[PDB]
Design a protein around this ligand. Structure first.
Ligand SMILES: *[C@@H]1O[C@H](CO)[C@@H](O)[C@H](O)[C@H]1NC(C)=O
Ligand SMILES: *[C@@H]1O[C@H](CO)[C@@H](O)[C@H](O)[C@H]1NC(C)=O
Lengths: 440, 440
């Protein structure tokens, strides 16, 4: 037997359904999503950290001249200044008043703390969805991780279940993300080899331990102060620190649908968007006979009280006279009510209590028990709390909240609108016939 | 200055261009794609090898009975055969004619050679195009690897180059691929937990070193032969061996566009499909005035000998009277002829030889020397050989193969037909005017 359903993607809320064969005992199915994970495929672009301007010692040549060598270091600047008179603690370092040269070098490398304080730039695409499910089909239970691609099956006790694909391709991450301090930022970082001074990614390394290091920090060299041995430089401040000074809240606080953003692996959790289409394949062996299950006779539904709150605010009692005791499946085929439980113990004679949640002011729902179908009615009242802390446990309709009062003052006005028109047409036809009969 | 162009995605064939500023010297561009890679993103979900049916030694009980241990191993199953009379080498094992029970159980493991002789199943999507480009602008050259995404820039001598994205999204790998022995197959394998006996993936392991193994081989235990201690079993022949027997040629032999599929990483190299858009950002310091480059005047092109073969069949010469010697660029702006080189040495006076490849019988091509522009004309002969081992070095138009005789015949038939129509219309108008004039 092939069954199909569509469970909304909402973690922590059970989904109970029933499989009714033509002449066999109903089969209860329950799916409880404990966690739904959306894991994008991220590849590392580069890693950024604070830079250190490691600068070589000034080489001073007295009474002579020097030349500069490249030395091939990241963003290295080498310059020779002519006319220096350096001073040490011991006195004048050089014995020529002029024509003394001082060559100074200044390069940049990753800071000593880049092994811990760094931000990784990722590119995200083709997100994959996984879901932790507690499944119960015909008393056969399982707790498993199912990939929400529509094709990967999870199988147990001969029953196969294929979940997904998710109805939406929406993902909280853009094409470029920045992970820093275990917290994902939705940033449009510069490409490798295209960083700019004073902004994120001014220095870029392909990997934390990679030897290569692109560096564009606008480093220049200034003339040393007279009578001083040092390498003066003026470069734009660190782009990593500037980015951290103003980076906006992360996706933990800005992602739509209330997604929870986690790292290692970069994933989103409990995104309340879309629905997962479930496909069950139940072998014919699991469908038992009708006589084995209890058969219900002379059952009626009484709605003790109904309050259309988010949680299970409605309660009903079914007066039943069953053929025998045992487990019995209960369901509501309509979408006007959702039962808390998909099964109930049943005796030979008595009353069964059923908890349900609804959004109707006046419920008219066709409850189903072991085999019979009992219509359950009543009225509901508004709940006593304005704001709650749990999501809605049911689904509403556009005509759910229209009470009998609204129906009366909508039908009387619209019906009365038509009645007067019909009266007018009838009078017009009658007088027209009378006029034609007046013609001699 | 920003220059946007396109380049055919054909490895080996050099692409030559000239950028022309308003009053500055023309600047040459030469891009040689040595190798183009198309690398899909692959996720490994399982591996498959030959299985080994392990069997526990039978547990024999004389005048007794035994019970089956619960199954805990891949495809493991147990059976207790009653009424056995085992018969070892040292006579009968049991002194008990009947009520002797032999427990025989079997299961499936990976073969001892699964570390080397295994095929791994991948899911491929979102191919990432890469290229190896040797680029030359303004006598400055660089050989590098360019990611053909439309954003990653390559920097050299202050010049930005951005290649891509590829004009087509075609990839040779299907959604599901299989890698075995360095060869890639487009196989729609069953996914993990859905392997079938006797076919590829009958036994599945998430990784090579993973301790999990899904086995489905129709392992069935049979009753032992009388007086024999052994575990007789029956199962479908290994699906990996069956797949190896008839798996069809790998992608290396069946891929369109002449792709070369390699492994580690799984990639397709040198596919003759699509075109690569190129964008150069050239700093204005590279452009030099026309005075610096050797200006040229009083030049003409004579076509020495033209044959419209795939290679550089045509040879021409230009008689030049240059102001001074030096480098000077040459290029055909149109697509009716592709030059062999992009620069030539010019003396004070003389003649310079040019090699070009053309596809038209009569090449009327508007050659562009670095300063003077010469229209070069002639006739071509067909090549001698029917088949060559080189690809086509030129681009042909729909009207390039039409000879002068065909043009005369078409402009005769069409054209003269319209002239005959025009004569008839003129005669009709003239006689209509004549008959209207004769009203009186
Ligand atoms: C399903 O299993 C999860 C995890 O063990 C548990 O939190 C949840 O209450 C279970 N649900 C049912 C209906 O057993
Ligand atoms: C570019 O470099 C490659 C590798 O060194 C070489 O094979 C090729 O001929 C070069 N192209 C040009 C135009 O020099």
């Amino acid at each position: 037997y092939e069954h199909a359903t569509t469970m909304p993607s909402q973690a922590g809320i059970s989904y109970n359904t029933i499989v009714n064969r033509a002449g066999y005992a109903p089969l209860p199915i329950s799916i409880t999503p404990t966690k739904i994970k959306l894991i994008p495929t991220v590849n590392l672009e580069y890693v950024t950290c604070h830079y250190k301007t490691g600068m070589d010692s000034p080489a001073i040549k007295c009474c002579g001249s020097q030349e500069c060598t490249p030395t091939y270091r990241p963003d290295e600047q080498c310059k020779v200044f002519t006319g220096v008179y350096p001073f040490m603690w011991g006195g004048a370092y050089c014995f020529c008043d002029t024509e003394n040269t001082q060559v100074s070098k200044a390069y940049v490398m990753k800071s000593d703390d880049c092994l811990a304080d760094h931000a990784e730039a990722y590119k995200a695409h083709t997100a994959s969805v996984q879901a932790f499910l507690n499944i119960t089909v015909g008393e056969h239970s399982i707790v498993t991780t199912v990939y929400v691609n529509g094709e990967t099956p999870v199988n147990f006790n001969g029953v196969k279940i294929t979940a997904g694909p998710l109805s939406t391709a929406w993902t909280p991450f853009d094409r470029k993300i920045v992970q820093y301090a275990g917290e994902i930022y939705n940033y449009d970082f510069p490409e490798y080899g295209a960083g700019q001074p004073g902004a994120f990614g001014d220095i870029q390394s392909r990997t934390v331990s990679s030897s290569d290091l692109y560096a564009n920090t606008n480093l220049v060299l200034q003339r040393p102060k007279a009578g001083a041995i040092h390498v003066p430089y003026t470069q734009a401040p660190s782009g990593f620190e500037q980015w951290k000074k103003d980076k906006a809240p992360s996706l933990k606080f800005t992602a739509p649908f209330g997604c929870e953003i986690y790292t290692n692996p970069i994933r989103a959790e409990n995104c309340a968007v879309g629905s997962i289409p479930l496909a069950f394949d139940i072998p014919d062996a699991l469908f038992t006979r009708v006589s084995e299950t209890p058969t219900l006779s002379a059952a009626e539904c009484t709605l003790n009280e109904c309050v259309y709150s988010s949680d299970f605010g409605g309660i009903a009692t079914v007066k039943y006279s069953a053929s025998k005791s045992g487990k019995c499946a209960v369901h509501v085929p309509s979408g006007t009510a959702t039962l808390k439980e998909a099964a109930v113990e049943l005796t030979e004679q008595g009353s069964a209590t059923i908890h349900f949640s609804t959004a109707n002011i006046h419920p008219e729902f066709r409850l189903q028990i072991c085999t019979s179908y009992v219509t359950c009615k009543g009225d509901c009242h508004p709940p006593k709390d304005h704001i709650v802390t749990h999501p809605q446990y049911h689904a509403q309709t556009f005509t759910a909240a229209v009470s009998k009062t609204a129906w009366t003052w909508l039908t009387s006005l619209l019906g009365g609108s038509a009645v007067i028109i019909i009266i007018g047409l009838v009078l017009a036809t009658i007088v027209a016939m009378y006029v034609l009969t007046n013609q001699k």
